Design an enzyme around this catalytic site. Structure first.
Site, PDB file in Angstrom:
ATOM      1  N   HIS A 460       0.902  -1.203  -0.140  1.00  0.00           N
ATOM      2  CA  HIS A 460       0.052  -0.122   0.090  1.00  0.00           C
ATOM      3  C   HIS A 460       1.007   1.214  -0.047  1.00  0.00           C
ATOM      4  O   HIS A 460       2.076   1.056  -0.190  1.00  0.00           O
ATOM      5  CB  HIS A 460      -0.966   0.053   1.175  1.00  0.00           C
ATOM      6  CG  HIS A 460      -1.740  -1.379   1.284  1.00  0.00           C
ATOM      7  ND1 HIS A 460      -2.738  -1.547   0.383  1.00  0.00           N
ATOM      8  CD2 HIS A 460      -1.512  -2.148   2.095  1.00  0.00           C
ATOM      9  CE1 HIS A 460      -3.095  -2.898   0.531  1.00  0.00           C
ATOM     10  NE2 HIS A 460      -2.508  -3.209   1.764  1.00  0.00           N
ATOM     11  N   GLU A 477      -1.957   0.151   7.997  1.00  0.00           N
ATOM     12  CA  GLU A 477      -0.990  -0.598   7.368  1.00  0.00           C
ATOM     13  C   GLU A 477       0.324  -0.220   6.664  1.00  0.00           C
ATOM     14  O   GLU A 477       1.310  -0.517   6.700  1.00  0.00           O
ATOM     15  CB  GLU A 477      -1.925  -1.609   6.759  1.00  0.00           C
ATOM     16  CG  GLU A 477      -0.938  -2.679   5.997  1.00  0.00           C
ATOM     17  CD  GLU A 477      -1.742  -3.567   4.953  1.00  0.00           C
ATOM     18  OE1 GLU A 477      -1.303  -4.516   4.476  1.00  0.00           O
ATOM     19  OE2 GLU A 477      -2.877  -3.515   4.958  1.00  0.00           O
ATOM     20  N   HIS A 530       3.155  -7.024   4.454  1.00  0.00           N
ATOM     21  CA  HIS A 530       1.694  -6.417   4.697  1.00  0.00           C
ATOM     22  C   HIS A 530       1.298  -6.678   6.120  1.00  0.00           C
ATOM     23  O   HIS A 530       2.112  -7.387   6.894  1.00  0.00           O
ATOM     24  CB  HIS A 530       0.819  -7.057   3.746  1.00  0.00           C
ATOM     25  CG  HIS A 530       0.565  -6.696   2.443  1.00  0.00           C
ATOM     26  ND1 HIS A 530      -0.249  -5.881   1.727  1.00  0.00           N
ATOM     27  CD2 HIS A 530       1.765  -6.721   1.417  1.00  0.00           C
ATOM     28  CE1 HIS A 530       0.185  -5.631   0.540  1.00  0.00           C
ATOM     29  NE2 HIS A 530       1.419  -6.162   0.225  1.00  0.00           N
ATOM     30  N   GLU A 603       2.379 -11.252   5.863  1.00  0.00           N
ATOM     31  CA  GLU A 603       1.228 -10.895   6.808  1.00  0.00           C
ATOM     32  C   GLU A 603       1.958 -10.952   8.288  1.00  0.00           C
ATOM     33  O   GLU A 603       1.506 -11.868   8.895  1.00  0.00           O
ATOM     34  CB  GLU A 603      -0.161 -11.454   6.665  1.00  0.00           C
ATOM     35  CG  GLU A 603      -0.777 -11.449   5.141  1.00  0.00           C
ATOM     36  CD  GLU A 603      -1.228 -10.208   5.005  1.00  0.00           C
ATOM     37  OE1 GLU A 603      -1.388  -9.261   5.775  1.00  0.00           O
ATOM     38  OE2 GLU A 603      -2.043 -10.017   3.833  1.00  0.00           O
TER      39      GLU A 603
HETATM   40 ZN   LIG Z   1      -2.116  -5.430   2.906  1.00  0.00          ZN
END
Ligand SMILES: [Zn+2]
Ligand SMILES: [Ca+2]
Ligand SMILES: [Ca+2]
Ligand SMILES: [Cl-]
Ligand SMILES: [Cl-]
Ligand SMILES: [Cl-]
Ligand code: NA
Length: 638
Positions: A460, A477, A530, A603
């Site tokens: 992002h 995030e 992420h 993640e």
């Molecule tokens: Zn993400």
């Protein structure tokens, strides 16, 4: 002396500006003087106007002439512009008055073109770099001498001396050396080496100011200094670093008012003090050393009576807590937490100080010192302050990732390399970024002639904030992935792995651009970073890898190694490594499906799970998360 000429810069480029100040013992009855210089057959002049406040002629030399041949500007004469009479001092007159004209020569360098290998020519686009001036010798003592010759070629009436192996003690000496316009040279506790003895003789000072009590620099060193040059020796040194910083601040206050302070933790913020040194030096305002929750009472009583206009705090919450901000905010007009500048480590703090205190996109210079020692930044400090330029610190073998944005966006006319030991590769990378605005981010990896290459992709950014949550004071995030990714990059570079980041700052960037970059770089491994979300429910770490390796392959090994390293420092639920596909059988994640190179997506944790986020609620914990990911990557590609 009868005439003193003080030039700000001795190394310039076309377009540089340099402040000049000329002081005459004699009252000339003239509002201005004109200095004439020549480089081969080309003239350059500057007019300096009389300033009654300082009894000096002051002005600026504008190096706006490009010489056809040679590149050293040599002073020829001074013309005194009286109303009724004009007098011209030519070279012989100036030499008759005691000047050695070569002491004022100024070298005009230019941006060079070289790339890393112009072995013949295949295309036409050369990599350019800001000129580099190297100031260094065999040890820290000779390096301090080369700095002294650069900014005080014509001598100095004062010299500051600090013990060279206890340099952490002279970390608040730069603002005082700058107030005296003096270099800092180095001593041992009971002697001075020949390098310092010869430079003290060359500078011909009248006074030496020792920082530190006799335990740091003893009477035995004082005698060897006076044997070199029979100066008056002043000593400023208290019971500990905090009192010495107070005594330095009182000494500065004898020259001009102290109304601003830069605070650092005396014993736990040595690199915080070093990182703000060039700026405190340029402002000639002190660095005040403190404890975590307060400055000592003696410091507090003196600061309370100074009528401070501004207080800045260099260091995170663990070094300077809200209690010292509360204490100082009550006695400074502008001393709130808004004035805190910090960083996950010495390099991020160095980059945030440069970003905050040197906002201009065009710097006059950048001084670059190794970040593993303290003394080279201390001796460079007086020169950085004279040049009104920042000191950048970075390890000897790589450009820290935290410098990427500042090096890309800004330019510097001259880059000074302090000390010996930094790789050519590193200083040249910095000098290339600083030759243009919005410079591409690439020599920072070019460093290795060969070796492993990894692409790190912080998910992002810009218009896309990614998942968000109200934990840890509000979390996005896109910012946690960027802080995690910078730390991963920093670990990989410190182990000799080349790293290209898809972005090193907050910016909008599409999946297709991140993947195209990966396909252009052809890395050994592409790692997207992420943070997960669901509701407060989901928690733990999982990594996605390519379905084609479901029963074994580089991305499955990469995901297993990183998951193992993360779990070695974080007690989070192990959600395992996972694959995910579209109905057509291909990987669901764009950066996996469209990458021609091994790729995974980490993640790290659930950004909306309190138990996970409690293990990532400080910059240092986020830095640990990035480091573990970097170790897992190194496991995989080495
Ligand atoms: Zn993400
Ligand atoms: Ca000078
Ligand atoms: Ca106040
Ligand atoms: Cl210079
Ligand atoms: Cl200037
Ligand atoms: Cl597609
Ligand atoms: Na740049």
């Amino acid at each position: 002396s009868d005439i003193n000429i003080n030039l700000q810069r001795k190394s310039v480029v076309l377009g540089s500006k340099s402040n000049a100040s000329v002081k005459f013992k004699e009252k000339l009855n003239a509002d201005s003087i004109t200095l004439n210089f020549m480089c081969y057959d080309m003239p350059l002049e500057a007019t300096l106007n009389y300033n009654e406040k300082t009894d000096s002629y002051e002005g600026v030399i504008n190096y706006n002439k490009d010489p056809e041949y040679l590149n050293v500007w040599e002073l020829q004469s001074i013309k005194i512009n009286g109303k009724d009479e004009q007098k011209v001092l030519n070279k012989e007159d100036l030499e008759s008055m005691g000047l050695n004209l070569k002491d004022y020569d100024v070298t005009q360098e230019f941006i060079i073109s070289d790339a890393n290998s112009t072995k013949a020519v295949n295309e036409y686009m050369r990599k350019t770099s800001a000129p580099v001036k190297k100031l260094a010798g065999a040890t820290r003592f000779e390096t301090a001498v080369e700095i002294s010759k650069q900014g005080w070629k014509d001598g100095s009436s004062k010299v500051v001396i600090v013990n060279g192996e206890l340099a952490a003690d002279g970390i608040t000496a730069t603002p005082l050396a700058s107030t005296y316009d003096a270099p800092i040279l180095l001593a041992n506790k009971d002697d001075i080496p020949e390098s310092t003895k010869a430079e003290l003789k060359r500078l011909n000072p009248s006074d030496v100011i020792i920082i530190g009590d006799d335990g740091s620099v003893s009477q035995k060193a004082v005698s060897q200094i006076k044997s070199a040059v029979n100066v008056n020796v002043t000593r400023i040194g208290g019971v500990d670093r905090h009192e010495t910083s107070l005594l330095i601040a009182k000494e500065i206050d004898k020259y001009h008012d102290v109304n601003k302070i830069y605070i650092a933790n005396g014993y736990a913020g040595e690199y915080d003090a070093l990182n703000i040194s060039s700026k405190a030096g340029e402002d000639q305002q002190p660095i005040i050393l403190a404890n975590k929750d307060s400055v000592p009472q003696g410091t507090y009583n003196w600061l309370s009576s100074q009528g401070l206009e501004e207080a800045y705090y260099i260091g995170g919450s663990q070094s300077l807590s809200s209690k010292i901000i509360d204490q100082i905010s009550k006695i400074a007009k502008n001393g709130t937490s808004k004035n805190r500048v910090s960083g996950a480590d010495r390099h991020e703090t160095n980059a945030n100080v440069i970003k905050t205190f040197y906002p201009d996109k065009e710097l006059s210079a950048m001084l670059v010192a190794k970040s593993d020692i303290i003394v080279d930044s201390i001796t460079a400090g007086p020169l950085a302050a004279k040049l009104k330029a920042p000191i950048l610190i970075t390890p000897k073998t790589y450009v820290s990732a935290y410098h990427s944005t500042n090096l890309s966006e800004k330019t510097a006319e001259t880059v000074y390399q302090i000390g010996d030991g930094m790789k050519d590769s590193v200083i040249n990378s910095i000098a290339s970024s600083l030759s243009k605005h919005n410079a591409p981010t690439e020599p920072d990896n070019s460093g290795s002639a060969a070796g492993k290459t990894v692409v790190i992709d912080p998910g992002h950014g810009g218009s896309d904030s990614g998942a968000t949550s109200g934990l840890n004071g509000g979390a996005q995030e896109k910012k946690y992935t960027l802080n995690t990714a910078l730390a991963t990059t920093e670990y990989l570079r410190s182990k000799g792995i080349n790293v290209v980041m898809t972005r090193d700052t907050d910016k909008t960037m599409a999946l297709g651009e991140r993947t195209a970059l990966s396909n252009t770089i052809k890395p050994d491994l592409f790692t997207s970073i992420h943070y997960n979300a669901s509701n407060g429910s989901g928690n733990g770490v999982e990594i996605y890898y390519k379905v084609k390796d479901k029963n074994g392959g580089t991305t499955k090994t990469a995901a297993s190694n990183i998951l193992k390293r993360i779990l070695e420092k974080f007690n989070m639920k192990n959600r395992g490594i996972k694959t995910r596909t579209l109905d057509n059988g291909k990987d669901y994640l764009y950066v996996l499906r469209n990458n021609n190179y091994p790729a995974i997506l980490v993640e790290c944790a659930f950004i909306d799970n309190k138990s996970d986020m409690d293990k990532l609620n400080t910059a240092e914990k986020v830095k640990t998360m990035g480091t573990q990911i970097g170790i897992g990557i190194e496991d995989t590609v080495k």
